[PDB]
């Protein structure tokens, strides 16, 4: 049996630390100019 049934597991307190490139997806991503397009659409609807 485990005598230490009350011992807690220890959280690792993650944040925004270290090299900022290890907290992105390693793979390259490149799919304003983004919301510009959908703002256009809403302006049309209102008429």
């Amino acid at each position: 049996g485990d005598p230490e049934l009350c011992a807690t597991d220890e959280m690792i307190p993650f944040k925004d630390e270290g090299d900022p490139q290890k907290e992105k997806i390693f793979a390259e991503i490149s799919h304003e100019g983004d919301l510009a397009d959908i703002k256009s659409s809403l302006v049309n609807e209102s008429e």
Binding site: D2, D9, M11, I12, K22, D34, L42, E47
Partner: protein, 503 residues
């Protein structure tokens, strides 16, 4: 021009007259240059705004509103939009019923925040934040997307705004969106506001209680990498506040799978989140075990090799999963079944750093609770290696990243468990450890006195050992610890003295 002369009379119309003049001005704003002639009539700019603010005829508003949006395109256009006080009015229009109005109001506000210096402050002052949070139950996803974006813009690098959003029930609203919609751009602007809030201490618990982990979890297999990325890192940052939630089945199952990703940063991330989400919550442990988490974690450890940004979190999760739940024994066995024991023991060696070695000794401790692991662990050379880490550690304390007290406790604790097996006991005293374990009884740390008394207790079940321990003068300190404040310490001291004089 002679168009400024026409704008003049356009400023008047104070009656039922007004209603028509708005339609006329609005229409003239559509031109490319007819948008310029109205720029340098601040009387008009300010009239367009007053009218909309006050006017209680629906179409009148959409014509004033529409007007400003046209003008919100040029770098001189927003400037006067601001200087004429349109912002607080825009923000007032965010309460309107007419969706044609709301769309103009929000698109214009967006433009301003992106470009017009002073907007951010101005919008906050008008109470835009609390307006925008309350609009988050509107139904047009394009609108939601822009609305959430505005929030992100105002929240960014501004903790006061973050707290205000928290206060307006923003977290629950944002989380509902993540649970409900599937439209990529909206999930993206929403995952962003969330990420930005997740760096606020007060918002963490709030995001969590609102079902934020489960909701993020729903989009981890989305095709949009930018979205998966925001979810993973937000999940990770929240994971320490999230150990008491239920309904985490789906998320846990997906995290296990993500351990198989080819993307390294996705793997490290998935390990981290799993490490935390396996802290103390026994239901989380059972589920992680049931979807084959031990096998995945072992595999992940082998794959990572010397990469400690991967092995430390993954070793920690393994450790959480090998104690203190209904399936902990099953997990202890699985590690052996899936060839984990040699990689585990190997991690006790260089180039491992102290934090990984800490976690690993912790894992080995749990591993040793399973009788079927006593011999295999011995075969891997766990014991001599633990004893070396122990001796080293104890020497450092006799005169970072980790404290050597933890390593001393950890190591001794692991040996305490390995001492259950008789052949292990022989190897143990075999390494001349009995004096070391007796001198440990004198440590100031009670945790250390406990594991020392523990290992002595197991060893003493054998007569030769007990005489050996008696010969070290253990009886004195044991008799004293008999009155330790620390329950365990005192409990083992009794235990050892008991066995010391059996005959």
């Amino acid at each position: 021009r002679a168009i400024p002369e026409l704008t003049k009379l356009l400023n008047d119309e104070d009656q039922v007259v007004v209603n028509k003049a708005a339609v006329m001005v609005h229409q003239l704003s559509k031109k490319e240059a007819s948008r310029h002639a109205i720029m340098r009539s601040p009387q008009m700019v300010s009239a367009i705004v007053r009218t909309m603010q006050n006017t209680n005829d629906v179409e009148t508003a959409r014509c004033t509103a529409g007007t400003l949006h046209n003008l919100s395109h040029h770098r001189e256009g927003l400037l006067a939009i601001f200087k004429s006080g349109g912002i607080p009015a825009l923000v007032k229009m965010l309460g309107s019923p007419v969706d044609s109005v709301l769309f103009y109001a929000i698109t214009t506000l967006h433009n301003l925040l992106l470009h017009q210096e002073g907007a951010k402050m101005a919008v906050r002052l008008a109470g835009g934040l609390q307006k925008m949070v309350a609009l988050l139950n509107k139904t047009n996803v394009k609108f939601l997307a822009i609305t959430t974006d505005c929030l992100q813009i105002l929240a960014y690098g501004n903790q006061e705004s973050k707290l205000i959003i928290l206060a307006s029930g923003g977290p629950q609203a944002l989380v509902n969106i993540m649970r409900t919609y599937t439209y990529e751009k909206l999930l993206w602007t929403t995952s962003r506001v969330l990420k930005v809030l997740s760096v606020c201490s007060s918002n963490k618990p709030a995001i969590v209680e609102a079902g934020g982990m489960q909701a993020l979890g729903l989009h981890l297999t989305d095709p949009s990498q930018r979205l998966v990325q925001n979810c993973l890192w937000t999940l990770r940052n929240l994971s320490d506040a999230a150990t008491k939630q239920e309904g985490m089945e789906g998320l846990l199952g997906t995290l296990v799978q993500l351990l198989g990703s080819d993307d390294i940063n996705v793997v490290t991330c998935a390990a981290g989140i799993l490490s935390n989400l396996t802290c103390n919550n026994y239901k989380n442990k059972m589920m992680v075990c049931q979807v084959g988490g031990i096998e995945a974690l072992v595999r992940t450890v082998l794959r990572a090799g010397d990469r400690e940004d991967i092995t430390e979190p993954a070793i920690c999760a393994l450790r959480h999963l090998t104690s203190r739940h209904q399936e902990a024994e099953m997990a202890q066995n699985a590690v052996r079944l899936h060839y984990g024991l040699p990689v585990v023991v190997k991690l006790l060696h260089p180039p491992s750093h102290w934090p990984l070695i800490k976690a690993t000794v912790g894992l080995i401790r749990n591993l040793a609770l399973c009788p079927a692991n006593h011999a295999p662990l011995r075969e891997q050379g766990a014991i001599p290696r633990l004893v070396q880490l122990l001796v080293r550690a104890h020497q450092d304390t006799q005169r970072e990243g980790v404290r050597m007290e933890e390593i001393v406790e950890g190591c001794t604790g692991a040996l305490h468990i390995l001492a259950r097996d008789v052949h292990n006991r022989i190897v143990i005293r075999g390494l001349n450890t009995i004096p070391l374990f007796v001198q440990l009884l004198y440590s100031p740390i009670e945790n250390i006195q406990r594991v020392a008394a523990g290992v002595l207790c197991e060893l003493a079940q054998d007569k030769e050992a007990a005489e050996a321990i008696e010969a070290e003068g253990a009886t004195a300190p044991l008799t004293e610890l008999l009155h330790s404040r620390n329950e365990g310490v005192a409990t083992y001291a009794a235990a050892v003295l008991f066995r010391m004089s059996e005959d």
